[PDB]
Amino acid sequence: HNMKAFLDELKAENIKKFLYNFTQIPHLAGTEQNFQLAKQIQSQWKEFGLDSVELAHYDVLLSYPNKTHPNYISIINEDGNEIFNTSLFEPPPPGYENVSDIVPPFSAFSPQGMPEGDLVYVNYARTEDFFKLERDMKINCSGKIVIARYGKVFRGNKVKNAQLAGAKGVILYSDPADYFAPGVKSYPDGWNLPGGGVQRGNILNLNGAGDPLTPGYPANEYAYRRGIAEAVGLPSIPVHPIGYYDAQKLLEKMGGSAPPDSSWRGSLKVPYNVGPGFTGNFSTQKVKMHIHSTNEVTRIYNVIGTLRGAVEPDRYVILGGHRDSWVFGGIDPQSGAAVVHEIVRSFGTLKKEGWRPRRTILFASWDAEEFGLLGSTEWAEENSRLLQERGVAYINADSSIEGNYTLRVDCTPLMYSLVHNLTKELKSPDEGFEGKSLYESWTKKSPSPEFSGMPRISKLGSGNDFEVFFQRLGIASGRARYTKNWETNKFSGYPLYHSVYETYELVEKFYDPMFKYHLTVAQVRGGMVFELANSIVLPFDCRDYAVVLRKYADKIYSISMKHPQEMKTYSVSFDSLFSAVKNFTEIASKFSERLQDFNPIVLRMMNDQLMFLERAFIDPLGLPDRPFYRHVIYAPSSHNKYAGESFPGIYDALFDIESKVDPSKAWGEVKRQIYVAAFTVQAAAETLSEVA
Amino acid sequence: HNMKAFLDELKAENIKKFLYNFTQIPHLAGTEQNFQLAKQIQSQWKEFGLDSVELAHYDVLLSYPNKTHPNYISIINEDGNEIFNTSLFEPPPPGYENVSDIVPPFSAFSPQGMPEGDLVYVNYARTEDFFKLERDMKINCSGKIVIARYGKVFRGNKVKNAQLAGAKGVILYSDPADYFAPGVKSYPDGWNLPGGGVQRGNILNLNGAGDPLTPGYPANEYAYRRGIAEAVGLPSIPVHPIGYYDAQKLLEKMGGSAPPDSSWRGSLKVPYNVGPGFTGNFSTQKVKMHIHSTNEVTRIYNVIGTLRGAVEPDRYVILGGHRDSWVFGGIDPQSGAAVVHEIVRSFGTLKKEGWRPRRTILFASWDAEEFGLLGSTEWAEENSRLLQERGVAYINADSSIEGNYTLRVDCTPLMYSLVHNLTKELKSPDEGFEGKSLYESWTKKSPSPEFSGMPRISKLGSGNDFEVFFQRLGIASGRARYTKNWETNKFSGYPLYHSVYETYELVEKFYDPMFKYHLTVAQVRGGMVFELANSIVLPFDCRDYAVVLRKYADKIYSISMKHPQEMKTYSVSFDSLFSAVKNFTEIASKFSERLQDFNPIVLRMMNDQLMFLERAFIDPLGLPDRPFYRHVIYAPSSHNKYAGESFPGIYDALFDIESKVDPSKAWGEVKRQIYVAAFTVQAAAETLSEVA
Numbered sequence A, B: 001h002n003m004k005a006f007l008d009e010l011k012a013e014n015i016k017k018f019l020y021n022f023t024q025i026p027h028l029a030g031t032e033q034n035f036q037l038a039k040q041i042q043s044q045w046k047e048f049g050l051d052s053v054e055l056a057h058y059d060v061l062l063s064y065p066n067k068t069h070p071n072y073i074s075i076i077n078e079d080g081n082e083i084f085n086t087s088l089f090e091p092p093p094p095g096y097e098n099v100s101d102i103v104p105p106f107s108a109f110s111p112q113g114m115p116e117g118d119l120v121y122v123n124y125a126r127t128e129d130f131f132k133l134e135r136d137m138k139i140n141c142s143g144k145i146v147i148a149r150y151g152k153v154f155r156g157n158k159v160k161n162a163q164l165a166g167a168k169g170v171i172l173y174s175d176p177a178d179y180f181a182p183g184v185k186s187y188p189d190g191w192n193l194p195g196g197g198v199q200r201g202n203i204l205n206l207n208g209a210g211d212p213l214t215p216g217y218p219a220n221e222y223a224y225r226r227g228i229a230e231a232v233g234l235p236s237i238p239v240h241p242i243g244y245y246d247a248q249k250l251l252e253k254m255g256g257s258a259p260p261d262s263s264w265r266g267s268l269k270v271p272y273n274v275g276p277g278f279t280g281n282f283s284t285q286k287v288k289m290h291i292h293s294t295n296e297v298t299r300i301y302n303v304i305g306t307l308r309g310a311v312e313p314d315r316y317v318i319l320g321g322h323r324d325s326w327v328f329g330g331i332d333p334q335s336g337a338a339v340v341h342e343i344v345r346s347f348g349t350l351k352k353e354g355w356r357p358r359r360t361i362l363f364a365s366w367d368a369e370e371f372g373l374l375g376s377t378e379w380a381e382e383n384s385r386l387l388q389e390r391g392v393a394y395i396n397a398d399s400s401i402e403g404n405y406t407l408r409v410d411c412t413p414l415m416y417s418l419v420h421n422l423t424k425e426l427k428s429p430d431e432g433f434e435g436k437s438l439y440e441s442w443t444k445k446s447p448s449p450e451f452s453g454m455p456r457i458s459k460l461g462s463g464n465d466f467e468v469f470f471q472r473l474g475i476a477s478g479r480a481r482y483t484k485n486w487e488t489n490k491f492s493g494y495p496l497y498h499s500v501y502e503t504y505e506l507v508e509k510f511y512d513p514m515f516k517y518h519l520t521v522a523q524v525r526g527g528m529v530f531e532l533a534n535s536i537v538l539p540f541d542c543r544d545y546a547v548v549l550r551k552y553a554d555k556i557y558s559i560s561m562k563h564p565q566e567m568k569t570y571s572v573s574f575d576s577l578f579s580a581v582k583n584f585t586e587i588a589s590k591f592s593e594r595l596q597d598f599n600p601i602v603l604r605m606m607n608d609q610l611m612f613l614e615r616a617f618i619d620p621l622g623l624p625d626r627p628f629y630r631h632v633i634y635a636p637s638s639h640n641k642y643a644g645e646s647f648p649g650i651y652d653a654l655f656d657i658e659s660k661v662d663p664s665k666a667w668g669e670v671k672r673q674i675y676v677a678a679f680t681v682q683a684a685a686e687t688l689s690e691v692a
């Protein structure tokens, strides 16, 4: 009963069967079908041999279209006649044309409204796109309906940016430039998005809050809810997503200013004029949204399975991923959920033969991830005291695939060594690498930008269920999946993301026919959990944090150094940060020596120092105006929730600082953030010093 | 080498010698004399045998009078002639008339100013005193100088209350009613305050922040400071303290309205008219303050001594008390500091014979307590991650005596059983109780109001160095000292509090000639530290928390039930709180069974559950507008920093609720606080459940 025993028990065929099982009907959060799947998973995890498996339910704000009053967009003429209407549903895929309860495309949490106005095209609606529009092109979005292409950043950031530009509505669409790979066919004949395809998704800006109505506290039976006007993160303008057939109709008539350059042009046979409004002949026509979706407090269900530790039952290693999907969830999340299911089954076989892991393993099937990480966050709010005193590590388990080229790992530096070592012991599933390790294929296909002979591992960003564990609670976290070639990655995900076309057949036919990439991902995620839950000494290397902290300090310093005059005027020094990083490096080196040179108390003392090291980067005061982003080293980018930002407090203080009215106040805040960062790094270092 | 060995080594004669040694010159925070005493203590603790003894220094905002521009108050006539001036200094006591660097009486952190106006007498300047003035008597304090008698509540609350009433200055004075015990002589012939005596003290409203310029972060070398206008807790009107000879001169001419009743009248031969202003003949005379004190960032020094644990070096039991005094500190703090010194010496003797405690003991000599708990708080801010993961308990050690009648203990419920047991094993020092236990004399003289055969133990309030450890960080905390008869206690402290007359001779002559009360307090504080640092199982009884939580829930419910109509209208239920308390009671009972029915891992797991139980009552979001008061069960009263309030969030939401303009919003907030309290109690209970 070792890791090899665990790993060998995992079967590609089982993952395939589970994926099929999980993807036959929609499992939208808050629906009966998803409660039924929750009860199924609970039953099976009990069968598989877990010690206890419970449902943890919460009543959270969700959002749904009105079934008898559909959402749509129009071009409207002078007289008020609707001369063009966008589609009410995606054409259903072959053999699903009679499946009921497919939620039509909508933007979750949009307010209701019927705004009419002139269109402005805002490219990807990124911060720099709005800078270009308002500063360089002098185009004013106030009272306009903005049309933006999906991609590059989380859609909630697009909506926030449009809102602050004064837009009265937002139309999101999938451009073939971003969601149609050259030379591959549209679904069902390949993996591309057809013109009638539409990406669902929420447009919240929760900043880690969880349920919009109950920030800080679980949405239990006696919870006291904020009123809707005080809710966290809701958009104040109507928003709706469309496909590129419909987008072409909205864009083809656009007049006003030309696109500023080619990076604003997608692939449609359209000028990509910015507007505002339409060309001469159509100048009196307007665009009208009709949004009637409702926000509703709705019950959600997490499945929580426990495999009690033999030696340290009060130490938790958590494998969690969500179960709710937009429609069938063929990739997102069921390709991940099937992998978790097989991992539970494998751990359970070992358990039935009398084995127990050293530490407690918790398994989670989260609900309502798609509506803002609501299930994971409410559960973590409920159990925060247990998690922060006992939480060793969190491994996420959403989609196992976003491509089929190579491995993707995003994790805390504390897990780098664990990942390098585990992947050296796993077989590559890649063509041309048969008989070679996963480590070998991965570093060959995804080389580190910094170190020869090492693979790329990214910072954790957000937009998934690790956010509460990592950035709020400071529990060492990681994720892994298969991905496309980093070199050709345009960072907008796979074409059928959150569409009705994301089905079992998509995966079985076009991504992973042999389920070998799924199996590899099961081995990586399960192998990580195994090592974290069983290794005598926690498998974290604090020295890996020391290396990246120096890299991040250099990076933030370099950003500041674009403003040498201001750094002189306001006496802005990074000396304290570099000093703290140097100290961390020295103390981490000494701690590592003791860790090899040392008695269960010294061990556990040692293990507690390892466990609480991620915890030490938490600031209980949070980051400015983002109280649930407490980690001082890593936060989701204020411009793109999906992206991780390092030294986020200093980064945001420096961002666009040349445009601040009061430079004294602005640079004062840069200095304050340097102080907080230097202090936190030093304090974290000191947790690794001898204890007395 | 057991507790008896430790206890027997403690000597009354040593405490006496140390008290004498610590009280010959003033030790004002931020002065050279107090840095010298810090270096002395450091040297002696090294000599006594501690493993390491370091100084931890910080640069914090302090406040001092201007030596060449003295503070004083005048009665000023029509022409602007100053016809009466208050005293510039307290007449120095016999044999100290040539001692230099006695800081004259002042209110630390007063702003500068010379306001002139009419006097209003506001009794003790409590919330209910201002309610009486403004609501019942229709007296408007706006633009008036208020005169208030010291006593009943922390002076900072008086100043806040006066400020919000619109006062333009505050004069604080010691009334003989509150600071002259009938039948005892004035210093030097007894322990009473003479008419020229004046009580120093800060008038901040920090609410746990520590250094006004650096809330959240230690005031280290690279700290970034708030500007003075954004500092925490500074008063916005000038304030000055005077003695009763001077107060009589200010009060004797007061006209306007009569005192509303006898509870407004002190003991001076004066009408206690409320004003505003003076009687007919003197109606054109005014009162003028002249305050020229300056706030200055100044270095302070804590002494931190470590005695490393043999078995759990990463578990800290902290004995801390301050060293800085207003003048000689004969009682406050040196009667406590001498006790700590002797405790260190006794632990050190044992250590030199080869003993070590099971857990690490930390000893602290804090600086700048008198200026707002600044030394303890900055150190805890620096070391917060170590303290919250490793902090077992904090025992405070300020003044060992406020009387000589019986024991006073204020502590967390987790220490009740420890205290009852320890005091049963100690000898009573009381006359008439020779050969009896301290427990016996204490419960006879200070009976519990609730339980026959038990002594009174109060809730922790604040106004001392345990505040950061208990209410911010959630470390189990306690204090103990000798006190006066509870039955005759008027709750304003001893007459010579913070006066020049608080000397070695005061204690040696009038409080504790034989130093037997000091020795008893050394045995209580040291005995507590010993048990906490050495007992195999931490000496906390979680069931004692269950009992008080029910008491507090009944109390808060009863307050709400004065508003039955509103509880009906707004559906205000305490059911969830009572449910959580019931659950806590049940789980605590089961945990206690396992604690006796159980392996060092199960033990330590068990010990961690005990250690983290106080920690579980912390809410990282803090209480409303008081982010550093995080404990949900106990906070300092919003009306009196010295007093502990239970369920403070709900208490403040209910306070004066009948006067709120918007009852819907007000009762909504009561419900929100009930939710937070019920959740926190349940979450704390669940930390005592089986871990997996």
Ligand SMILES: *[C@@H]1O[C@H](CO)[C@@H](O[C@@H]2O[C@H](CO)[C@@H](O[C@@H]3O[C@H](CO[C@H]4O[C@H](CO)[C@@H](O)[C@H](O)[C@@H]4O)[C@@H](O)[C@H](O[C@H]4O[C@H](CO)[C@@H](O)[C@H](O)[C@@H]4O)[C@@H]3O)[C@H](O)[C@H]2NC(C)=O)[C@H](O)[C@H]1NC(C)=O
Pocket: A576, A577, A579, A580, A583, A678, A679, A682, B054, B055, B056, B057, B221, B222
């Ligand atoms: C990285 O780790 C190193 C430790 O190796 C830390 O070094 C400390 O750095 C600060 C400087 O920022 C030093 O602070 C200075 O302390 C002097 C007194 O120190 C005595 O006491 C301590 C223990 O209390 C002993 O360790 C020490 O050896 C001495 O016995 C003060 O006199 C200094 O203040 C004077 O100079 C400054 C600067 O010019 C003026 O602003 C002041 O007004 C004053 O005149 C100063 O405060 C500290 O001594 C160093 N410690 C050690 C052990 O060397 C780094 O701080 C750490 N980096 C971070 C970011 O934490």
Ligand SMILES: *[C@@H]1O[C@H](CO)[C@@H](O[C@@H]2O[C@H](CO)[C@@H](O[C@@H]3O[C@H](CO[C@H]4O[C@H](CO)[C@@H](O)[C@H](O)[C@@H]4O)[C@@H](O)[C@H](O[C@H]4O[C@H](CO)[C@@H](O)[C@H](O)[C@@H]4O)[C@@H]3O)[C@H](O)[C@H]2NC(C)=O)[C@H](O)[C@H]1NC(C)=O
Pocket: A054, A055, A056, A057, A221, A222, B576, B577, B579, B580, B583, B678, B679, B682
């Ligand atoms: C003190 O400790 C007790 C445990 O002994 C807690 O009791 C829980 O109390 C809540 C009620 O507030 C119960 O919640 C209810 O759960 C039902 C489903 O429960 C099932 O699943 C759980 C595990 O997930 C099992 O433990 C349980 O036995 C069941 O199998 C829901 O159906 C209920 O909702 C319905 O009724 C309410 C109220 O009328 C409506 O508002 C809803 O719309 C809905 O129709 C309800 O949510 C919970 O089951 C109890 N747990 C147990 C183990 O008994 C107390 O909560 C605790 N006190 C505090 C303050 O925490």
Ligand SMILES: *[C@@H]1O[C@H](CO[C@@H]2O[C@@H](C)[C@@H](O)[C@@H](O)[C@@H]2O)[C@@H](O[C@@H]2O[C@H](CO)[C@@H](O[C@@H]3O[C@H](CO)[C@@H](O)[C@H](O)[C@@H]3O)[C@H](O)[C@H]2NC(C)=O)[C@H](O)[C@H]1NC(C)=O
Pocket: A070, A072, A080, A081, A082, A083, A084, A085, A088
């Ligand atoms: C675009 O859609 C609008 C609105 O139509 C409604 O919503 C759609 C998304 C679908 O769900 C439709 O089934 C649904 O009707 C169309 O305009 C609408 O046309 C209808 C029928 O022509 C109008 O109905 C009325 O009927 C009676 C007479 O029988 C009279 O009271 C009225 O005079 C009117 O004729 C309806 O008013 C009108 N609604 C709006 C808001 O304009 C529109 O035709 C369509 N455009 C296309 C297909 O190009």
Ligand SMILES: *[C@@H]1O[C@H](CO[C@@H]2O[C@@H](C)[C@@H](O)[C@@H](O)[C@@H]2O)[C@@H](O[C@@H]2O[C@H](CO)[C@@H](O[C@@H]3O[C@H](CO)[C@@H](O)[C@H](O)[C@@H]3O)[C@H](O)[C@H]2NC(C)=O)[C@H](O)[C@H]1NC(C)=O
Pocket: B070, B072, B080, B081, B082, B083, B084, B085, B088
């Ligand atoms: C109350 O105190 C005031 C102020 O006196 C000053 O502050 C005190 C607390 C002590 O530190 C004093 O030593 C200090 O002077 C007294 O009023 C002041 O009186 C003096 C002397 O009479 C005035 O000095 C001036 O001197 C020259 C002439 O030699 C001329 O320029 C002026 O015409 C004036 O006479 C001083 O102006 C005056 N100050 C104020 C603010 O009023 C006051 O007498 C005293 N009251 C008592 C003892 O009842």
Ligand SMILES: *[C@@H]1O[C@H](CO)[C@@H](O[C@@H]2O[C@H](CO)[C@@H](O[C@@H]3O[C@H](CO)[C@@H](O)[C@H](O)[C@@H]3O)[C@H](O)[C@H]2NC(C)=O)[C@H](O)[C@H]1NC(C)=O
Pocket: A020, A021, A024, A039, A040, A043, A044
């Ligand atoms: C996905 O897999 C699950 C688990 O295999 C399937 O659910 C299972 O379905 C079977 C057959 O429908 C159920 O067995 C039946 O039980 C009832 C008594 O409760 C009895 O009347 C029948 O004779 C039959 O034995 C079984 O309860 C159920 N198991 C669980 C744990 O839910 C499910 O059908 C699969 N879904 C798809 C879409 O393929």
Ligand SMILES: *[C@@H]1O[C@H](CO)[C@@H](O[C@@H]2O[C@H](CO)[C@@H](O[C@@H]3O[C@H](CO)[C@@H](O)[C@H](O)[C@@H]3O)[C@H](O)[C@H]2NC(C)=O)[C@H](O)[C@H]1NC(C)=O
Pocket: A417, A418, A421, A538, A539, A540, A541, A596, A597
């Ligand atoms: C990933 O694998 C590497 C390579 O096995 C691990 O590093 C190795 O860890 C071992 C065990 O602690 C080290 O052995 C030690 O060697 C020193 C002498 O150099 C000796 O004093 C100790 O008694 C012990 O035997 C070994 O040096 C070390 N190798 C390297 C190259 O660092 C690493 O720990 C693994 N990472 C994780 C997270 O498990």
Ligand SMILES: *[C@@H]1O[C@H](CO)[C@@H](O[C@@H]2O[C@H](CO)[C@@H](O[C@@H]3O[C@H](CO)[C@@H](O)[C@H](O)[C@@H]3O)[C@H](O)[C@H]2NC(C)=O)[C@H](O)[C@H]1NC(C)=O
Pocket: B020, B021, B024, B039, B040, B043, B044
């Ligand atoms: C309070 O007690 C302390 C500790 O006993 C006293 O401080 C100590 O004073 C002695 C005598 O003044 C010092 O010894 C001297 O040392 C110097 C060399 O440094 C030498 O020239 C002298 O011959 C003498 O031996 C001693 O250093 C000092 N100890 C410490 C730890 O500070 C202090 O005097 C007492 N204070 C009062 C007010 O009674």
Ligand SMILES: *[C@@H]1O[C@H](CO)[C@@H](O[C@@H]2O[C@H](CO)[C@@H](O[C@@H]3O[C@H](CO)[C@@H](O)[C@H](O)[C@@H]3O)[C@H](O)[C@H]2NC(C)=O)[C@H](O)[C@H]1NC(C)=O
Pocket: B417, B418, B421, B538, B539, B540, B541, B596, B597
């Ligand atoms: C304060 O002192 C009291 C009285 O000594 C302590 O309570 C006592 O603690 C002992 C040791 O855990 C208990 O003994 C146990 O008895 C049960 C059977 O009743 C047995 O199963 C266990 O093996 C064990 O021998 C004893 O019952 C208990 N007495 C009472 C009256 O509760 C208390 O723990 C002390 N408090 C602290 C904080 O140390």
Ligand SMILES: *[C@@H]1O[C@H](CO)[C@@H](O[C@@H]2O[C@H](CO)[C@@H](O)[C@H](O)[C@H]2NC(C)=O)[C@H](O)[C@H]1NC(C)=O
Pocket: A066, A067, A068, A069, A294
């Ligand atoms: C979904 O849409 C329909 C409208 O097509 C809503 O039903 C109407 O609601 C209004 C306002 O409450 C009533 O005055 C009408 O009597 C209803 N009209 C019809 C034709 O039924 C319905 O409320 C919406 N559903 C939700 C959940 O908001």
Ligand SMILES: *[C@@H]1O[C@H](CO)[C@@H](O[C@@H]2O[C@H](CO)[C@@H](O)[C@H](O)[C@H]2NC(C)=O)[C@H](O)[C@H]1NC(C)=O
Pocket: B066, B067, B068, B069, B294
């Ligand atoms: C203490 O008080 C004296 C005044 O009696 C202050 O000294 C004066 O300061 C002002 C304003 O800065 C100067 O214009 C004068 O030249 C000074 N006058 C005298 C008579 O010396 C002194 O600054 C105060 N000290 C502090 C620390 O504030």
Ligand SMILES: *[C@@H]1O[C@H](CO)[C@@H](O)[C@H](O)[C@H]1NC(C)=O
Pocket: A140, A141, A142, A143
């Ligand atoms: C944009 O338009 C609105 C409303 O017409 C106006 O109030 C606002 O100031 C404009 N902004 C700029 C930068 O021109």
Ligand SMILES: *[C@@H]1O[C@H](CO)[C@@H](O)[C@H](O)[C@H]1NC(C)=O
Pocket: A191, A403, A404, A510, A511
């Ligand atoms: C899956 O792998 C093949 C290589 O055999 C590749 O050509 C194909 O495009 C991949 N599928 C996806 C969806 O990327």
Ligand SMILES: *[C@@H]1O[C@H](CO)[C@@H](O)[C@H](O)[C@H]1NC(C)=O
Pocket: B140, B141, B142, B143
């Ligand atoms: C008290 O006096 C001030 C200034 O004279 C006035 O503005 C204020 O409204 C008064 N308050 C009451 C309650 O009379």
Ligand SMILES: *[C@@H]1O[C@H](CO)[C@@H](O)[C@H](O)[C@H]1NC(C)=O
Pocket: B191, B403, B404, B510, B511
């Ligand atoms: C100290 O004890 C005696 C009893 O012997 C008492 O009369 C005296 O008032 C006490 N001193 C103080 C300061 O309370």
Ligand SMILES: [Ca+2]
Pocket: A209, A210, A211, A213, A214, A215, A216, A217, A218, A219, A377, A378, A381
């Ligand atoms: Ca919540």
Ligand SMILES: [Ca+2]
Pocket: B209, B210, B211, B213, B214, B215, B216, B217, B218, B219, B377, B378, B381
């Ligand atoms: Ca501070």
